[PDB]
């Protein structure tokens, strides 16, 4: 059990495919859904959770392995999302005005970020690679940046007059900022109501699954404007009600969990 | 009025002794004003 190390693995091509770990992973794992308040609002039923649980019970998932966790709105969810389960599903409504925020949410939860803190009053920060971004959470973040030159002086901005800084956010609950990698930036931030963290995007999180409910696929996880990929756990649906959506999820929960895979870290 | 004269119940401030013993008449309040004051904030200073 050599943890903290990475060793060469080996195998063969003559070994046969083993049994189906389904009907056991459901029992020794847990499934957490994240629905919006609009769903329960439209529904207007108190026993819909027990109903979906008794339905899951047919697919194999036992009674107390399923969890439902409401969220009033996509931004309130983006505010410190704490996903601690063994299989997470996230039903996400589409709004053309919220596109960037509901893509930042995806880039935050679908992936696994290694996040170090940040202190703006003392230091001036720079990015090193293309995956070392700055994610800001809080209730209203107003972020301004002033890049510096080789000799610690601004570029189109002054290091005293914060009004001359360059604005990238304006009262956003979640922000993910990428800047030019190789230049030191001086920052202004609403530290009182927002925390900023310098995070490196590691390999992806195979434990969550986003399901867009409405419009066409728009989520550009990769900040670089060349890939625009569609990952396997990035699902779309077209909706007019919510019971049909929940029945679809329950009937196709095995494909979802096949698209997902228990975490590594 | 002026006793011993026909000038009675006239309305107005007579300029004989307007102060009436008081050191000064005072009025308090606030007031806001717009101006075109100069500033740079903070340009035109040396580059360093
Ligand atoms: C593997 O699957 C086969 C076919 O269902 C079954 O007969 C066998 O018992 C399974 N292996 C074990 C160890 O149960
Ligand atoms: Ca946002
Ligand atoms: Ca970058
Ligand atoms: Ca400027």
Tab-separated table of C-alpha atoms and ligand atoms in Angstrom:
chain	number	residue	atom	x	y	z
A	1	UNK	CA	0.000	0.000	0.000
A	2	UNK	CA	2.661	2.481	-1.125
A	3	UNK	CA	0.826	5.791	-1.079
A	4	UNK	CA	2.584	9.048	-1.946
A	5	UNK	CA	4.422	7.288	-4.815
A	6	UNK	CA	3.652	6.276	-8.413
A	7	UNK	CA	4.909	2.918	-9.705
A	8	UNK	CA	4.789	1.138	-13.099
A	9	UNK	CA	1.674	-1.012	-13.455
A	10	UNK	CA	1.629	-4.163	-15.598
A	11	UNK	CA	-0.885	-6.662	-16.925
A	12	UNK	CA	-1.681	-8.790	-19.971
A	13	UNK	CA	-4.162	-9.264	-22.830
A	14	UNK	CA	-5.235	-12.888	-22.144
A	15	UNK	CA	-7.252	-12.198	-18.976
A	16	UNK	CA	-11.032	-12.345	-19.372
A	17	UNK	CA	-13.498	-9.575	-18.583
A	18	UNK	CA	-14.734	-9.951	-15.011
A	19	UNK	CA	-18.293	-9.670	-13.700
A	20	UNK	CA	-20.510	-6.572	-13.736
A	21	UNK	CA	-19.700	-4.446	-10.674
A	22	UNK	CA	-23.086	-2.787	-11.194
A	23	UNK	CA	-25.644	-3.930	-8.581
A	24	UNK	CA	-22.746	-3.675	-6.058
A	25	UNK	CA	-21.397	-0.185	-6.723
A	26	UNK	CA	-24.956	1.147	-6.342
A	27	UNK	CA	-25.155	-0.509	-2.925
A	28	UNK	CA	-21.708	0.550	-1.650
A	29	UNK	CA	-21.954	4.094	-3.132
A	30	UNK	CA	-24.163	7.185	-2.860
A	31	UNK	CA	-25.890	9.417	-5.420
A	32	UNK	CA	-26.584	13.124	-4.827
A	33	UNK	CA	-28.828	15.162	-7.126
A	34	UNK	CA	-28.768	18.970	-7.282
A	35	UNK	CA	-32.071	20.318	-8.659
A	36	UNK	CA	-33.343	23.930	-8.842
A	37	UNK	CA	-36.154	25.341	-6.698
A	38	UNK	CA	-38.280	25.778	-9.848
A	39	UNK	CA	-38.628	21.985	-10.058
A	40	UNK	CA	-40.196	21.473	-6.626
A	41	UNK	CA	-42.157	24.696	-7.196
A	42	UNK	CA	-43.786	23.399	-10.394
A	43	UNK	CA	-44.252	19.962	-8.792
A	44	UNK	CA	-45.993	21.078	-5.559
A	45	UNK	CA	-45.669	17.675	-3.871
A	46	UNK	CA	-44.171	16.768	-0.496
A	47	UNK	CA	-43.431	13.062	-1.165
A	48	UNK	CA	-41.652	13.384	-4.530
A	49	UNK	CA	-38.333	12.567	-2.843
A	50	UNK	CA	-39.648	9.319	-1.353
A	51	UNK	CA	-41.224	8.640	-4.758
A	52	UNK	CA	-37.945	9.002	-6.658
A	53	UNK	CA	-36.259	6.928	-3.938
A	54	UNK	CA	-38.757	4.072	-4.301
A	55	UNK	CA	-38.161	4.345	-8.063
A	56	UNK	CA	-34.358	4.192	-7.725
A	57	UNK	CA	-34.969	1.112	-5.532
A	58	UNK	CA	-36.071	-0.705	-8.704
A	59	UNK	CA	-32.890	0.275	-10.560
A	60	UNK	CA	-30.859	-1.023	-7.590
A	61	UNK	CA	-29.883	2.093	-5.642
A	62	UNK	CA	-31.189	1.434	-2.080
A	63	UNK	CA	-33.393	3.837	-0.128
A	64	UNK	CA	-30.874	5.823	1.914
A	65	UNK	CA	-28.178	5.941	-0.779
A	66	UNK	CA	-29.950	8.735	-2.717
A	67	UNK	CA	-29.808	12.375	-1.622
A	68	UNK	CA	-31.482	15.501	-2.997
A	69	UNK	CA	-29.922	18.919	-2.343
A	70	UNK	CA	-31.819	22.005	-3.470
A	71	UNK	CA	-30.369	25.295	-4.680
A	72	UNK	CA	-32.366	28.471	-5.282
A	73	UNK	CA	-30.302	29.644	-8.258
A	74	UNK	CA	-27.204	28.939	-10.335
A	75	UNK	CA	-25.290	31.841	-8.781
A	76	UNK	CA	-26.181	30.878	-5.201
A	77	UNK	CA	-24.917	27.407	-6.159
A	78	UNK	CA	-21.725	28.843	-7.688
A	79	UNK	CA	-21.158	30.532	-4.299
A	80	UNK	CA	-18.882	27.933	-2.637
A	81	UNK	CA	-20.197	24.683	-4.183
A	82	UNK	CA	-19.429	21.894	-1.695
A	83	UNK	CA	-19.970	18.609	-3.562
A	84	UNK	CA	-19.123	15.768	-1.153
A	85	UNK	CA	-20.651	12.516	-2.417
A	86	UNK	CA	-19.645	9.479	-4.486
A	87	UNK	CA	-21.752	10.308	-7.576
A	88	UNK	CA	-23.039	13.866	-8.115
A	89	UNK	CA	-25.610	14.988	-10.689
A	90	UNK	CA	-26.394	18.669	-11.289
A	91	UNK	CA	-29.469	19.736	-13.267
A	92	UNK	CA	-28.786	23.165	-14.756
A	93	UNK	CA	-31.255	25.537	-16.390
A	94	UNK	CA	-30.242	27.566	-19.434
A	95	UNK	CA	-30.280	31.363	-19.550
A	96	UNK	CA	-28.487	33.245	-22.336
A	97	UNK	CA	-27.621	36.038	-19.870
A	98	UNK	CA	-26.107	33.543	-17.373
A	99	UNK	CA	-24.051	31.583	-19.981
A	100	UNK	CA	-20.651	32.715	-18.687
A	101	UNK	CA	-21.541	32.022	-15.052
A	102	UNK	CA	-22.997	28.582	-15.785
A	103	UNK	CA	-19.859	27.800	-17.816
A	104	UNK	CA	-17.602	28.946	-14.971
A	105	UNK	CA	-19.617	26.679	-12.660
A	106	UNK	CA	-18.910	23.790	-15.040
A	107	UNK	CA	-15.193	24.635	-15.299
A	108	UNK	CA	-15.151	24.708	-11.462
A	109	UNK	CA	-17.014	21.473	-10.610
A	110	UNK	CA	-16.269	19.212	-13.621
A	111	UNK	CA	-12.540	19.704	-12.918
A	112	UNK	CA	-10.349	19.342	-9.829
A	113	UNK	CA	-8.548	22.550	-8.881
A	114	UNK	CA	-5.503	22.773	-6.603
A	115	UNK	CA	-6.124	26.098	-4.878
A	116	UNK	CA	-3.550	28.194	-3.009
A	117	UNK	CA	-4.561	31.411	-1.209
A	118	UNK	CA	-3.836	34.998	-2.207
A	119	UNK	CA	-3.147	38.286	-0.407
A	120	UNK	CA	-3.459	41.416	-2.522
A	121	UNK	CA	-2.286	44.050	-0.018
A	122	UNK	CA	1.306	42.704	0.003
A	123	UNK	CA	2.243	40.968	-3.255
A	124	UNK	CA	1.793	41.305	-7.001
A	125	UNK	CA	0.976	38.041	-8.749
A	126	UNK	CA	1.714	36.503	-12.138
A	127	UNK	CA	0.593	33.358	-13.915
A	128	UNK	CA	3.093	30.658	-14.881
A	129	UNK	CA	1.172	28.265	-17.167
A	130	UNK	CA	-2.135	28.402	-19.044
A	131	UNK	CA	-4.003	26.445	-16.317
A	132	UNK	CA	-3.002	28.682	-13.346
A	133	UNK	CA	-6.106	30.876	-13.072
A	134	UNK	CA	-7.671	33.028	-10.337
A	135	UNK	CA	-11.134	31.992	-9.095
A	136	UNK	CA	-13.108	34.498	-7.006
A	137	UNK	CA	-16.120	33.497	-4.894
A	138	UNK	CA	-18.462	35.625	-2.822
A	139	UNK	CA	-21.673	37.627	-2.920
A	140	UNK	CA	-20.486	40.542	-5.102
A	141	UNK	CA	-16.952	40.505	-6.544
A	142	UNK	CA	-15.647	43.613	-8.337
A	143	UNK	CA	-12.196	42.719	-9.670
A	144	UNK	CA	-9.786	45.156	-11.325
A	145	UNK	CA	-6.291	44.400	-12.655
A	146	UNK	CA	-3.322	46.607	-13.567
A	147	UNK	CA	-0.480	44.799	-15.384
A	148	UNK	CA	3.083	45.896	-14.654
A	149	UNK	CA	6.196	46.190	-16.806
A	150	UNK	CA	9.707	44.836	-16.155
A	151	UNK	CA	10.489	47.795	-13.842
A	152	UNK	CA	7.352	47.605	-11.635
A	153	UNK	CA	5.257	50.296	-13.310
A	154	UNK	CA	1.770	50.070	-14.738
A	155	UNK	CA	0.659	49.668	-18.344
A	156	UNK	CA	-2.168	52.086	-19.100
A	157	UNK	CA	-2.777	52.303	-15.341
A	158	UNK	CA	-1.243	53.932	-12.266
A	159	UNK	CA	-0.305	52.020	-9.114
A	160	UNK	CA	-2.241	54.523	-6.882
A	161	UNK	CA	-5.369	55.569	-8.821
A	162	UNK	CA	-7.492	52.405	-8.655
A	163	UNK	CA	-9.985	54.048	-11.051
A	164	UNK	CA	-7.456	53.679	-13.895
A	165	UNK	CA	-7.260	49.893	-13.379
A	166	UNK	CA	-8.812	47.528	-15.929
A	167	UNK	CA	-12.110	45.895	-14.965
A	168	UNK	CA	-12.803	42.214	-15.716
A	169	UNK	CA	-15.670	41.601	-13.256
A	170	UNK	CA	-18.495	43.754	-11.900
A	171	UNK	CA	-20.583	42.376	-9.008
A	172	UNK	CA	-20.295	38.693	-9.921
A	173	UNK	CA	-20.814	35.907	-7.401
A	174	UNK	CA	-18.330	33.608	-9.183
A	175	UNK	CA	-15.495	34.658	-11.491
A	176	UNK	CA	-12.671	32.731	-13.176
A	177	UNK	CA	-9.941	35.043	-14.485
A	178	UNK	CA	-7.135	34.196	-16.898
A	179	UNK	CA	-4.620	36.918	-17.783
A	180	UNK	CA	-1.403	37.125	-19.776
A	181	UNK	CA	1.028	34.553	-18.387
A	182	UNK	CA	4.379	36.266	-17.812
A	183	UNK	CA	3.365	39.661	-16.361
A	184	UNK	CA	2.807	40.732	-12.763
A	185	UNK	CA	-0.639	42.147	-11.967
A	186	UNK	CA	-1.743	44.464	-9.176
A	187	UNK	CA	-5.287	43.690	-8.062
A	188	UNK	CA	-8.251	45.469	-6.525
A	189	UNK	CA	-10.939	43.217	-5.038
A	190	UNK	CA	-13.795	43.464	-2.525
A	191	UNK	CA	-11.971	41.340	0.052
A	192	UNK	CA	-14.728	41.906	2.631
A	193	UNK	CA	-17.412	40.062	0.613
A	194	UNK	CA	-15.218	38.001	-1.759
A	195	UNK	CA	-12.318	35.560	-1.493
A	196	UNK	CA	-9.929	35.103	-4.432
A	197	UNK	CA	-7.765	31.991	-4.761
A	198	UNK	CA	-4.956	31.191	-7.197
A	199	UNK	CA	-5.773	27.722	-8.510
A	200	UNK	CA	-4.162	25.277	-10.927
A	201	UNK	CA	-6.458	23.096	-13.017
A	202	UNK	CA	-5.360	19.483	-12.624
A	203	UNK	CA	-6.934	16.522	-14.406
A	204	UNK	CA	-10.718	16.391	-14.458
A	205	UNK	CA	-13.169	15.329	-11.774
A	206	UNK	CA	-14.985	12.184	-12.925
A	207	UNK	CA	-17.398	12.372	-9.969
A	208	UNK	CA	-19.904	15.048	-11.079
A	209	UNK	CA	-22.246	15.199	-14.066
A	210	UNK	CA	-23.804	18.412	-15.388
A	211	UNK	CA	-27.109	18.106	-17.261
A	212	UNK	CA	-28.197	21.218	-19.134
A	213	UNK	CA	-31.991	21.283	-19.212
A	214	UNK	CA	-32.719	23.785	-22.004
A	215	UNK	CA	-30.759	25.466	-24.774
A	216	UNK	CA	-28.025	24.282	-27.122
A	217	UNK	CA	-24.630	23.164	-25.856
A	218	UNK	CA	-22.519	26.260	-25.134
A	219	UNK	CA	-20.245	25.348	-22.185
A	220	UNK	CA	-16.600	26.105	-23.067
A	221	UNK	CA	-14.793	24.455	-20.145
A	222	UNK	CA	-11.330	24.978	-21.631
A	223	UNK	CA	-10.518	28.682	-21.312
A	224	UNK	CA	-8.444	28.530	-24.507
A	225	UNK	CA	-10.520	29.583	-27.605
A	226	UNK	CA	-9.470	26.602	-29.759
A	227	UNK	CA	-10.907	23.435	-28.207
A	228	UNK	CA	-14.548	24.209	-27.308
A	229	UNK	CA	-14.950	20.542	-26.297
A	230	UNK	CA	-17.990	18.527	-25.236
A	231	UNK	CA	-16.964	16.108	-22.497
A	232	UNK	CA	-18.738	12.816	-21.861
A	233	UNK	CA	-20.276	13.986	-18.561
A	234	UNK	CA	-21.717	17.148	-20.149
A	235	UNK	CA	-25.305	16.229	-20.942
A	236	UNK	CA	-28.165	18.068	-22.634
A	237	UNK	CA	-31.946	17.676	-22.495
A	238	UNK	CA	-34.929	19.576	-23.903
A	239	UNK	CA	-37.692	20.192	-21.376
A	240	UNK	CA	-41.225	21.398	-20.932
A	241	UNK	CA	-41.910	19.801	-17.506
A	242	UNK	CA	-39.753	18.428	-14.662
A	243	UNK	CA	-41.341	15.051	-13.885
A	244	UNK	CA	-40.307	13.889	-17.361
A	245	UNK	CA	-36.756	15.057	-16.627
A	246	UNK	CA	-36.573	13.207	-13.312
A	247	UNK	CA	-38.035	10.062	-14.882
A	248	UNK	CA	-35.458	10.308	-17.679
A	249	UNK	CA	-32.624	10.652	-15.144
A	250	UNK	CA	-33.912	7.694	-13.120
A	251	UNK	CA	-34.434	5.471	-16.167
A	252	UNK	CA	-30.961	6.318	-17.564
A	253	UNK	CA	-29.065	6.531	-14.272
A	254	UNK	CA	-26.841	3.624	-15.350
A	255	UNK	CA	-25.507	5.420	-18.437
A	256	UNK	CA	-24.877	8.500	-16.261
A	257	UNK	CA	-22.878	6.507	-13.710
A	258	UNK	CA	-21.027	4.762	-16.550
A	259	UNK	CA	-20.058	8.212	-17.848
A	260	UNK	CA	-18.906	9.020	-14.300
A	261	UNK	CA	-16.097	7.291	-12.406
A	262	UNK	CA	-15.201	7.358	-8.692
A	263	UNK	CA	-12.534	9.924	-7.931
A	264	UNK	CA	-8.768	9.422	-7.671
A	265	UNK	CA	-7.640	12.032	-5.133
B	1	UNK	CA	-44.899	103.482	16.824
B	2	UNK	CA	-43.708	106.818	18.217
B	3	UNK	CA	-45.633	107.874	21.344
B	4	UNK	CA	-46.858	111.503	21.301
B	5	UNK	CA	-47.206	111.438	17.480
B	6	UNK	CA	-49.784	110.418	14.884
B	7	UNK	CA	-47.573	107.555	13.591
B	8	UNK	CA	-49.295	104.448	15.000
B	9	UNK	CA	-49.514	100.829	13.797
B	10	UNK	CA	-47.021	101.273	10.967
B	11	UNK	CA	-45.436	98.045	9.706
B	12	UNK	CA	-41.709	98.034	9.027
B	13	UNK	CA	-38.225	98.003	10.500
B	14	UNK	CA	-37.137	101.483	11.701
B	15	UNK	CA	-33.454	102.252	11.159
B	16	UNK	CA	-32.990	104.098	14.478
B	17	UNK	CA	-31.708	101.117	16.516
B	18	UNK	CA	-32.039	98.011	14.319
B	19	UNK	CA	-29.673	95.834	16.369
B	20	UNK	CA	-31.794	96.273	19.537
B	21	UNK	CA	-28.963	95.483	21.938
B	22	UNK	CA	-28.007	92.113	20.435
B	23	UNK	CA	-24.343	91.400	19.757
B	24	UNK	CA	-25.206	89.762	16.422
B	25	UNK	CA	-28.002	88.056	14.500
B	26	UNK	CA	-27.124	84.464	13.572
B	27	UNK	CA	-28.525	81.982	11.043
B	28	UNK	CA	-27.384	78.355	10.689
B	29	UNK	CA	-27.715	75.870	7.866
B	30	UNK	CA	-25.989	73.888	5.135
B	31	UNK	CA	-25.265	74.588	1.485
B	32	UNK	CA	-23.979	72.571	-1.478
B	33	UNK	CA	-22.165	74.035	-4.479
B	34	UNK	CA	-20.802	72.779	-7.801
B	35	UNK	CA	-17.411	73.910	-9.085
B	36	UNK	CA	-14.946	73.221	-11.909
B	37	UNK	CA	-11.960	72.795	-9.547
B	38	UNK	CA	-8.599	71.650	-11.016
B	39	UNK	CA	-6.911	68.292	-10.514
B	40	UNK	CA	-4.999	65.534	-12.321
B	41	UNK	CA	-5.500	62.418	-10.141
B	42	UNK	CA	-2.537	61.904	-10.447
B	43	UNK	CA	-1.133	62.480	-13.936
B	44	UNK	CA	1.533	65.008	-15.058
B	45	UNK	CA	3.861	63.691	-12.314
B	46	UNK	CA	7.288	62.219	-13.227
B	47	UNK	CA	7.172	58.702	-14.693
B	48	UNK	CA	8.994	57.461	-11.545
C	1	LIG	C1	-19.356	-14.012	-13.216
C	1	LIG	O1	-20.508	-13.962	-14.071
C	1	LIG	C2	-21.019	-15.255	-14.425
C	1	LIG	C3	-22.158	-15.026	-15.390
C	1	LIG	O2	-23.221	-14.307	-14.779
C	1	LIG	C4	-21.446	-16.008	-13.169
C	1	LIG	O3	-21.892	-17.310	-13.528
C	1	LIG	C5	-20.281	-16.104	-12.195
C	1	LIG	O4	-20.714	-16.696	-10.976
C	1	LIG	C6	-19.717	-14.716	-11.908
C	1	LIG	N1	-18.564	-14.804	-11.026
C	1	LIG	C7	-18.663	-14.832	-9.693
C	1	LIG	C8	-17.370	-14.921	-8.941
C	1	LIG	O5	-19.747	-14.789	-9.120
C	2	LIG	CA1	-19.697	34.640	-13.457
C	3	LIG	CA1	-3.279	32.010	-18.268
C	4	LIG	CA1	-6.646	52.210	-17.700
